[PDB]
């Protein structure tokens, strides 16, 4: 029954896709910077006690190929025994890294593990790595491949979320992200990015539009660029959800997650490993779970995964103080809130990826660290973190403040 604790949880600011501040910064550099910040916080940490470095990364090609986790271990000059493994479970990679790190600590065969993710989407765009489910016609034709936005629009159609409904959520996310930054909530967790000369590159989340109005959101066109712009995917979706006549395309760039660059790091160890290194535990990993739902609608995996992690930890919704669901698309959060009857004042209380962006491999570890701080800032007890995943998967984690 080895218990797993979170000792540090940090992240870079999120640079935007068009004329972004992080476009000149290699993703490896984003991870090394966060390793150097952990050193600044614990200069007498025995890095030899760090036994693995697990990084989530959805497009491990180019700047992100070749086991970027191992590259961060070597480029930062960490001990060669610290390992380094990249994993890809689509949008949950960051949280799957953290959960895998927790499970390794619980097993008793790893003591102190670094976990997180990195995604420089302006340099390595989504889909760069290819893949059978999209690029092999036999498999594409069978699994009924459909981009996520179309599943999200379909969720809005089936559930009755209007264009104004998803826009009302987008506005709320912008307002709560602005309030959290202005309130200093992110001061100690967002680590500014600097060049080799020490000059500043980025110290805030560029994608935010804190002057968002409900009238400007209504002026936006449903204009996804890429696979969604090509034809057929609407018909493929309705061939499965055949009781639906037409898909209402409610999602735009203003109520969908932002394409951004970023990285996040989380330090996880046992009580003995933390006490041996003068570390103060911040939170405890209570339970993790994985489940999933149909891959055509895709983004409904959170509800069985959240259900499973609650029954695994012996808890219910009323036992949870904060719910943090990644804002991939507004309809997914509204669907999740409706199904579990999540009170509004507990849901994504500091804003989410609609305002600040969704750096695929890293997002799960960013919103994980976001709840560690918000539990401490409110002196709240429990937080539940979950993300939808491409292909119909879901990951959930429950943390407890210590």
């Amino acid at each position: 029954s080895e218990e797993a604790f979170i000792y540090e949880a940090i992240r870079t600011p999120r640079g935007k896709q068009k004329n972004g501040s992080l476009h000149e910064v290699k993703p490896l550099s984003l991870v090394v910077g966060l390793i150097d910040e952990l050193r600044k916080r614990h200069p007498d940490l025995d890095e030899n006690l760090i036994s693995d470095v697990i990084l989530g990364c959805v497009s491990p090609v180019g700047d992100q190929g070749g086991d970027i986790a191992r590259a961060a271990v070597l480029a930062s000059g960490m001990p060669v025994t610290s390992g380094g493994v990249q994993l890809n479970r689509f949008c949950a990679s960051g949280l799957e890294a953290v959960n895998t790190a927790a499970q390794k600590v619980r097993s008793g065969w790893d003591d102190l593990v670094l976990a997180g993710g990195v995604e420089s989407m302006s340099r390595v765009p989504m889909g760069s790595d290819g893949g059978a489910m999209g690029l092999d016609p036999a498999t594409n034709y069978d699994v009924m491949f459909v981009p996520q936005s179309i599943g999200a629009d379909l969720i809005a159609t089936i559930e009755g979320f209007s264009r104004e409904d998803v826009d009302a959520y987008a506005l709320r996310s912008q307002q709560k992200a602005a309030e959290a930054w202005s309130g200093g909530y992110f001061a100690k967790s967002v680590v500014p990015v600097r060049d080799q000369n020490g000059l500043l590159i980025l110290d805030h989340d560029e994608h935010m539009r804190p002057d968002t109005t409900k009238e400007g959101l209504a002026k936006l066109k449903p204009a996804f660029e890429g696979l969604a712009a090509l034809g057929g995917f609407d018909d493929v979706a309705l061939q499965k959800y055949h009781w639906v006549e037409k898909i209402n395309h409610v999602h735009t760039g203003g109520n969908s997650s932002g394409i951004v660059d970023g990285a996040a790091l989380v330090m996880i160890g046992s009580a003995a490993a933390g006490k041996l290194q003068g570390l103060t535990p911040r939170a405890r990993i209570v339970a993790t779970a994985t489940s999933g739902a149909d891959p055509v609608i895709m983004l409904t995996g959170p509800t069985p995964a959240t259900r499973k992690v609650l029954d695994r930890a012996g808890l219910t919704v009323d036992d949870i103080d904060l719910f943090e669901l990644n804002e991939a698309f507004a309809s997914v959060v509204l669907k999740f809130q409706k199904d579990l009857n999540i009170p509004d004042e507990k849901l994504n209380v500091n804003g989410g990826a609609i305002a600040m962006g969704h750096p695929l491999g890293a997002t799960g570890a960013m919103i994980l660290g976001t709840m560690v701080d918000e539990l401490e800032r409110r002196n709240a007890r429990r937080a539940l973190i979950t993300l939808c995943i491409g292909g119909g998967m879901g990951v959930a984690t429950i943390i407890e403040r210590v």
């Binding site: 290699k26 340099r123 080799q196």
Partner: protein, 733 residues
Amino acid sequence: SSHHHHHHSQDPNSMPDNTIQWDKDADGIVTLTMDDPSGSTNVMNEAYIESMGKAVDRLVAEKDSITGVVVASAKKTFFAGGDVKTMIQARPEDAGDVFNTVETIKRQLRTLETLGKPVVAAINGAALGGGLEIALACHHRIAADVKGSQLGLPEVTLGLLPGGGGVTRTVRMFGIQNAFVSVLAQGTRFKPAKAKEIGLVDELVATVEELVPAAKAWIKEELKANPDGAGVQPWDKKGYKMPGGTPSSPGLAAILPSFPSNLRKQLKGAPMPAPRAILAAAVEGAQVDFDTASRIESRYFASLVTGQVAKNMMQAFFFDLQAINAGGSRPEGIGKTPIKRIGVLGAGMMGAGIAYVSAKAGYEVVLKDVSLEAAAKGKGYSEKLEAKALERGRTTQERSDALLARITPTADAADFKGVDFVIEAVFENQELKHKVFGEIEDIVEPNAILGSNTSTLPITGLATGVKRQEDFIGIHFFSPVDKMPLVEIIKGEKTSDEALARVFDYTLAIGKTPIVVNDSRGFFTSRVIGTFVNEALAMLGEGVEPASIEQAGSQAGYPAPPLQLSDELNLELMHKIAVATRKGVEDAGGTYQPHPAEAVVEKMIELGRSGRLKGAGFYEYADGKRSGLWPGLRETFKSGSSQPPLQDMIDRMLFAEALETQKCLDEGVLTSTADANIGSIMGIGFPPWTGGSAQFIVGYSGPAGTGKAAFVARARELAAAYGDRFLPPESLL
């Protein structure tokens, strides 16, 4: 956004002068003529940046009435270099200002380049560094094939990189591999003909008067024939494809990991950061758009300018070298004395090399040896060097035959008639040189310079064998003479100031760099290089692996590892010097403190391995080439029993020479640190990244700190661990 350094109000008396003249013809072609009134050379300084800012602003404001631009110069050269006096002062805290300055420079060139109109560079003379970068921002380059003109990006030779777009644009034009290897990594300078061949220049003209007209002619034709693509660089067109591919190209991605390894192999692991930074900027920039790539280039530039190595190299290869070439060590108030016929005594590797560089500079040389057979094989040294230069195309069959024709091999002393400059390169023996000079001093002219190429023997003693000791002087060359750039001029106690100047002027004529050294035991080069090899032989005696020793020498930045170099110096001559030094000490009434290397020398003498000249040293010599380390070396000295850290080995070699250089400065062997720095770099091969063995002290950088105080701390560290010879002199305390 802005093309100017400041966007707030400054002192009106601090406004820089105007360096760019504006002229617009009736056809709408604007000619920008750079003419900095503060010097003879257009240089990238505060005045240029403000001047180009005003001009580029006016280009944009008057874009309706402007059809094309011509960038010309009013000086003898086109545009040469940057403001080194300002760059060398950039502290690490000034990295923000450095970044902003080069960003502003490139913002001007980017606007010029994306004007929608053809821009032509009328390159009339040298276009070096920032000058070529200005030209590369133009859409078409025309150079005037004229004597002295050079083109290139030699920023790496001062520890910098081309921060005004030189990296980004040459990579966009030639691709990563060719830009780095051919242009960037070594800062190669090109004559206009070669510049056109590789693509640095597009056209040539015979004289400068044709340049501006040819430029305007090309603007007229380009607008007529290619109106859609006029004023559009290849990289600003849809469908641009980088030559050799981008990093994501499968072909270039295959060999790309070998680029840093081949660099480490070339640099031998020396701590020279500039080439690494050029390679990083080159590759990283080829992954992103032009503007993003250009900003990455600025960050690496600021990383080098604020670093210590660039300061060491700017101090040595700019300031120190200019002071030497300006006659800092040449005595004042002495006139010129042209040289008619040179007489070289000795056809060995030294004397044959001296004859080659003397005849290459246009002098008639009489090459005398003991036999005509030997003197003929001496001229064969020049024949083999010319034959290898003809098959490479660096010289004509006409100029080569005229070179060899100036070398007259002889065995008769009477053929030294009409010689006004003697350079003796016979064996290291005092009474021999006394004999050899006595047999020619009457045959040569009365005002002839009597020079001796010696490595060890004092000049004042050698002068007692001639009548006119006022004209006896030491002219120390370095083997191989055709490739070694220093001449150590040694002033004996009776040597006149006129003789110093004539050899000084001779050294510059043959294309070499002179230093002036007072007569002393070992002078400067020999004495200092001795502390280098002796430090390595002592390491061998202590039981350090020979392979580690040679790696430490190579990773310190030396051109040759110390055991290899010892074989070429001949261990028997090292012993003779040690015996000589002990003799002078024990006869003056004192006690001699032997260097721990003297035991290692004697052990190799006893084993019959005195160096390369007798076929066996620390290396095995087969087929005239060198063939690995002697396998018996590890058992003779118990190699492996002592395993010091590599940096300690490196530092012991560097510090031994730095400390010895300070002694030469204290004793008066050298009169200026400029001579000490260039003498160590060009004479004995002290690593260029240090800026010289004197700069190494004031510019030292280690994990303990920076500067003279950190040098002394580290010297005291080495002294407590390896011997008192590493204790610093009082002059440093």
